[PDB]
Design a protein around this nucleic acid. Sequence first.
DNA 1: CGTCCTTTCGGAAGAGATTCAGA
DNA 2: TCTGAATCTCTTCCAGCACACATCAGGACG
RNA 3: GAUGUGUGCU
Lengths: 653, 1316
Amino acid sequence: VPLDGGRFATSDLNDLYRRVINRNNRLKRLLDLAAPDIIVRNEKRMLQEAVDALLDNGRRGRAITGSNKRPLKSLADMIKGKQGRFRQNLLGKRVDYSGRSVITVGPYLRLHQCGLPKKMALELFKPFIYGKLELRGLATTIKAAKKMVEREEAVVWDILDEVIREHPVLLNRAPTLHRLGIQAFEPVLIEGKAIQLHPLVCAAYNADFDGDQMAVHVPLTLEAQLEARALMMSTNNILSPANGEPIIVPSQDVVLGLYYMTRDCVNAKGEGMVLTGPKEAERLYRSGLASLHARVKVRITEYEKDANGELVAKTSLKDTTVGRAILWMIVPKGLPYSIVNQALGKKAISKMLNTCYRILGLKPTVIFADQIMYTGFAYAARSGASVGIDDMVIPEKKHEIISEAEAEVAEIQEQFQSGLVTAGERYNKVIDIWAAANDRVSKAMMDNLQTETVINRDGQEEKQVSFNSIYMMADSGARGSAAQIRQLAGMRGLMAKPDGSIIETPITANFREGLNVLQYFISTHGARKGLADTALKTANSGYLTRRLVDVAQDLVVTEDDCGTHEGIMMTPVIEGGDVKEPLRDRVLGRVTAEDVLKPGTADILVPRNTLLHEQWCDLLEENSVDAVKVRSVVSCDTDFGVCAHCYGRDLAR
Amino acid sequence: VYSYTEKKRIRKDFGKRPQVLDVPYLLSIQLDSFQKFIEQDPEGQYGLEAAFRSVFPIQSYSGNSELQYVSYRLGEPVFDVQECQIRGVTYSAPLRVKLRLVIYEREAPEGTVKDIKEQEVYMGEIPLMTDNGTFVINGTERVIVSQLHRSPGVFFDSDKGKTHSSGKVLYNARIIPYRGSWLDFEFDPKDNLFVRIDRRRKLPATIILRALNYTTEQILDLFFEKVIFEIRDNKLQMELVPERLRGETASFDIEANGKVYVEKGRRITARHIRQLEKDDVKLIEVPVEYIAGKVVAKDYIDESTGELICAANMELSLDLLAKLSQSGHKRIETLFTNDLDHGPYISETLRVDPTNDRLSALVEIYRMMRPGEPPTREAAESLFENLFFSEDRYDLSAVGRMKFNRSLLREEIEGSGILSKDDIIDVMKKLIDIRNGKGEVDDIDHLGNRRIRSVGEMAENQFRVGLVRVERAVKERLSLGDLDTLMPQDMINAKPISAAVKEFFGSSQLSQFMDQNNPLSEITHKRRISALGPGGLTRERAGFEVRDVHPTHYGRVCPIETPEGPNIGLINSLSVYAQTNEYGFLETPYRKVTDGVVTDEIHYLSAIEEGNYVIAQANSNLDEEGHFVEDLVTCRSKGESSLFSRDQVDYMDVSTQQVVSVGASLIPFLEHDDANRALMGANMQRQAVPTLRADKPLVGTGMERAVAVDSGVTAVAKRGGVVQYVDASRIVIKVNEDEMYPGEAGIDIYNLTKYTRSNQNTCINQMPCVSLGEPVERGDVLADGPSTDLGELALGQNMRVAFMPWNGYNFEDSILVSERVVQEDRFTTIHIQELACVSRDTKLGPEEITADIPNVGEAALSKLDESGIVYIGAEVTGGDILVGKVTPKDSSLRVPNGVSGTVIDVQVFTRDGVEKDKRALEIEEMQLKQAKKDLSEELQILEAGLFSRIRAVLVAGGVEAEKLDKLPRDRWLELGLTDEEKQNQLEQLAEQYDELKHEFEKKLEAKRRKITQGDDLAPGVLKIVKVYLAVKRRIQPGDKMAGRHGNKGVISKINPIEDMPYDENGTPVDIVLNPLGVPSRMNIGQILETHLGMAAKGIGDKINAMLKQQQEVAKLREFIQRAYDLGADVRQKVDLSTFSDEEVMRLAENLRKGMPIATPVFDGAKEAEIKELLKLGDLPTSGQIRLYDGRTGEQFERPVTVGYMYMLKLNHLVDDKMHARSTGSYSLVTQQPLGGKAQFGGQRFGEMEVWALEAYGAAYTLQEMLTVKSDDVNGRTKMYKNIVDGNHQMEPGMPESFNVLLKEIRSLGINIELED
DNA sequence: CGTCCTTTCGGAAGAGATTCAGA
DNA sequence: TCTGAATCTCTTCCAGCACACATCAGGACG
RNA sequence: GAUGUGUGCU
Ligand SMILES: [Mg+2]
Ligand SMILES: [Zn+2]
């Protein structure tokens, strides 16, 4: 390849191929001249080394270097390795009809919608646009249409809004760790340069919006569009293939909103009134005549499908709030009422979605997830649920607890001076009393936060779980924990050295007071331990997942039943204390191997070849069986495959 | 008392404790090092003198000829810095060394010389360093990052654990020289001591002890202490010293002089030893068969025949005792090898040693070092003598010798740079001492073992490498001497020196392209300690223990400013107060604490001189003379924090900032951030791009006026004076005569750097911050740089944040920016970019730049002038023609796709013999004019001074002032006056005036000649044309914004003004951040900074009210004083009574945007004071107001946190990241789409996305992703045709990159093929 | 220009190759 | 003094993506 | 186009 100038760019193969012909034709000359034996011997050795460097350079003693003192790349070095032909040009590759950009939120989309910049859709779908500027006669040839798009006339829009109508595009995020990292959304053309990305798919993608980028690919052919719609469409993926757990889980603002809404305060704007339905609850909240946390008696009609798939209504008069009745306007028909008649944290609404999915199917759940999203966003914005400094409330007893523990470490120091305790005993006692003090400060601050708000109940006075902001967004599981809320208002704890040994004087402050110059140096030990860790950890999990994909890489379900009477003996796992995993989880969705005998022994409880399901596990629990022979994949008798029965439930469908 | 750019806007300081030591010059590790390398030192250490003196005088093979170094000197550069950046050449200074060649006569080894001769030979052109620690290598600005490596010396490590799989710890003594070979010593699981040279392969250490000319007797003399047995009348009693009996069991009945002391088998208690010392009995009876386990020390020959009875190092038995007794060997010397304390390591090693004498060992070493070669006497002798014993191939430097002599507890630190026998034997002795149980190994990450090797070194090293190449070439060329004609330049070749220096400065691992997109970035690039680089460790093979933050990092290296990902803790950043010892180790300041008083004298303690002392923490309350308020105070004794008594301490940290770097110390309220979020804050704050209109931080740290002054962007006064003329592009200071030199008094001129391009394609642009007729004093800013405000760093803007969820537009980390933030053009940045067009002489004739372009409309050639190049000022867009270039068959230079701009500077270069084009000299005629505009200003001021001297002469001795100014300024000399020395001075003034005109003419001609030179280009090209478009990037949904507390986000919307939340005065919020961002990632600093910003802006709004409805200066003065005093025990203490009733009005006029508040890092404001300051405004002390919804008009049913956060605009712009591609160009060898955004390239459907398509089952999407829109060339155009034919169907083939694989396998000797 | 020429902060398998220590 | 088991060398691999710069046989004799 | 270096981002 000609570099910039008259010169010629170096190619290592040509260097090796010239080094070979030199210690060649020269040797041919020497064998023509019949030169002495030793000089021709050395020339033959140089030919041997030239060939050994040409084929596999470096497998010898010392790799020869052409320039810059860097071993030049032989033939066997463009075939192997991460930069070889196999892993670089022949297992993954650069791709046309594709682009990338920065993702922003777009909380108005629906699960099947992304928002493409109006300038990136006109570049991906360019030939699709030519094939309509040429079919409508708005142009005549490919040059007319090419310029027609180049100058972006006002007609290469909606032509573009039509080549885009029901044509999905794939949206890939950089480390595609699992398969949910490629999902196909329908595009919505937006003004801008950021790829707006529905909030409920961020969990699957593992994508915050702090600056990470996505890659759109365009499925050209027709089977690729029906695959992107019937297999990859972000709607078809509301369960995880790794476990039967949901993956469309509302998080961190949809749940602070649904929590602030569905919660009670023991007094409010209207706390007695008896409403006449959810619509009147909304009409009252919106008018400012009732508080979203009031305690009203609503009259709700809930549907239940106890019939053979038929919904029968029941109208009752429930004790709820105004918010839990405003929210019952989005819950589909079929779900009970005691699904919103609580204070919904993150788990409560993830379980509400997970029960909608199993009672009403997939389409009501895909419609319910967007409703939950919009109505959690609305009522989280409508609440102003901010965070200030007076919200991290330090306990009144933190000074006393810390002074007590300080006096106790001084007492143990006095015990050590007299020699009644050795070094290790002293250290362990000091660690123990400081850990007990940390626990006491944690409990003090948590009691002070949680039960704090005391409010006059229209009688004398009364306690109630608090409306503290940081406590709300910790208790609702929105974003927070107890460890963190404790490093903010309680004490920060016992920090460990880089090797692992605990420092025997704990950080006794928090980020609402200040850390010392030394308390903040002590913290950086374990702050950089757990960053060097996550930087040295990705390059090591990626290699494991690559070796795992390459070991299996071909286990396609090539039969429907292998007819085996083998299997494993699924039993609830127990290590000595609590049951680590019940039988229902370890046996669900799998095909039994032998008929499980009820402890009414000699009567078959379950047949021999039944995929179980939720209810069959319930029935195994009633008769309280504790060992089921189940058909596993490691006992299948098919060849070059696995029968669909020795696998079981799909776990995603 | 305050400076002159201080009673202009004075930042309120909340710091509580005085600063006994002020922040040093920030970037001083670069300038000191280079000023040491380049300097003139007569003592020959260190520097260039050291290099020469270490290589010269160089002599031939005793050929009675010698080339000796006399001196050196550094010529003036042929340019200045700016001309070097403009042309594209290094800013270097030629090196002229005055050499000398002396040749002695035949039979004259000390006699007179035949001929002496000397000259100055040019060797190498060494790059110089700018005033800011940067180098200009090829027109760009580079920084040579300091390096952190292992200081030469001896290091005893252990390799605990992971060898031998038995949990037995080995031990190893590695001797690292500054230049030479390594000499590891290590132990074996069988406790045999093996040497290992250059890491090659073990061989018993006694091989090297023998190579040092030692016999086994002498070795056992060296390493073992002897036990003495004596042949006597009977039973052969043994000489015993009671100490050796410590800790074993009785082998026999221990008695002394017939009385029993210790019984068989009993453990000899220390009581027995001490009582035996009481008896003082040395000769002890011994059973003759007990000696059967001992080893003889010295060889024993017979006395009659002289035959060797038993040589050194062989066990004993009754038969050997008989052979010795019959001969009469009254003395027996055996080795005391405790099994516990004095292990028998050298004995066993001698038993494994195959060699016997010196020559055998030398041959064994030669056979290990140079394998496959038949050894010899001279070959092995010379090799081992050149390994560690020749100053030409080994060097423990001064530092290696110091650490060596220190680790062995020797006394003197000076010494010889090469090893010696005693050095090696003592290394082995200390190793065996460690093995025994006394002594301890040292860590490898302790900052007492790691040096810092900055630019004044490594450049001396590379220059010395070039110098040894030169001296080798000369030594050769000096033996073939054609004497009497060789000047000392026919032999000196400046290709080695220049090549080595250029290869170090231009292309190395520590020579990085400067990071220049705000002052902080470059000023914290220059203070960067890289552990990587040539001679250090590597990202991939670096453990977890190199990354961690050792406890000796306190005060020497930042703990919270280091990149993320691959190299965390390999790229540490120097701390604020940290210096480099004369040896290279990091030392930090510490106030000495006398009897109980915290003195004010500071000592710079390194890392080893700090585990000895107990150092009081940085914030420990003193009382008016330095007595700690309490009796037990926190301190750190030996890398271990703990409490101590008040009297035990003997040092105390200087400042509370000295633990953090200078980037981590710009974070207000750092002590409230979790160190992860503070690390992210430091970095992202380093990435912020300079906005259109700088804006101070309301919540600062006080370290902004240092960072923005010590980084150099700003034009700072050199000598005080009065401003005489201020233009947008030059300042003129008339110097105070108290600071003028005797002769040529004059003024000094500062040419500001107007819109010019930085390395990152941004605008670096100085503008004056002074005004006409206004005093300045030394060292205070005259012009502001990029992203500073009144000489005070300002990376972003202060915008009014509301922490609340807003309809999910700030969902994860996003940010909801108002539309007023983009109406006010406050995050608009400027970005210039040079496009190039080179005219090379191809075949079929060269290529010229004419405008004659075939097959183009006239709209294209409309913007080009007649010469072919674009018009300076033409608003171009994507696709337009910028330069017209013609290919003899058309390769004109065109605007890349989608990049707008306005052409601000066209710039043409030409080699010589190519005449010119009208455009090419009408460019650079402007440089002629603008240099005349300076020279003429100097000439006018100087001739004015001269004619003023003339008139001042003509006012004494017959004054004529009325008719002097009538006649022109020419003949004012010979009016009515005497002929004394005053008239002599008049004649001197006439001749000086003529000399002035002549010298101004000659210097202007010098400028025009340096301007009109020929600037040789790269060979193969005729003329280059660079066109500089200038862009303005406005904030828009997609690009990052950040705070200084690691709270970044991506703008998800620009909301209308009427949709933002507003408060009870209708004032809309500027940005809306999410609350849920704060609790989880515990960066509470952003919330306290929000509240303090609200307090500061409340103060500013009170001043704006008091100053809008004009109020007397008395009320302003009293309110601003109330704001500046504010409560607690602080050290600020401003007094406005000494302000001049006009310098308080300007103060208030600068405080109307908001009083700026400081908060030193771990010494900040407290909520008592923040709330007091909110009350001093009129804002709610809770920091939370009641916001209204902008679009439904009703309350957010909660008070929300509203305040002023200082937001930054990181330069991860979105219109720099958005890319799309349908079809473009494809690669050459593997016909796949090209990569990246410049080449219109496609995204990489990686190897991991294939598994995500295989998982779904999507077998058609995958096939079209790797066949049709990718390698397969024949079925890749059929798809284009099908697509633009109404068909969507692929006729797929075989990827042309599988055929490349088949051909590259079939081009090995491997027949791979396809079957049927 | 044209043109000819020749060092050393890694951890697992596994494959020599030795050693050994044993009948 | 023929042989299974414990040490000794040396091989192979170690997450993905974008963007700046530099260097392209060059050294030297004709 | 290949390689290297460096920075950055996930
Ligand atoms: Mg992210
Ligand atoms: Zn099966």
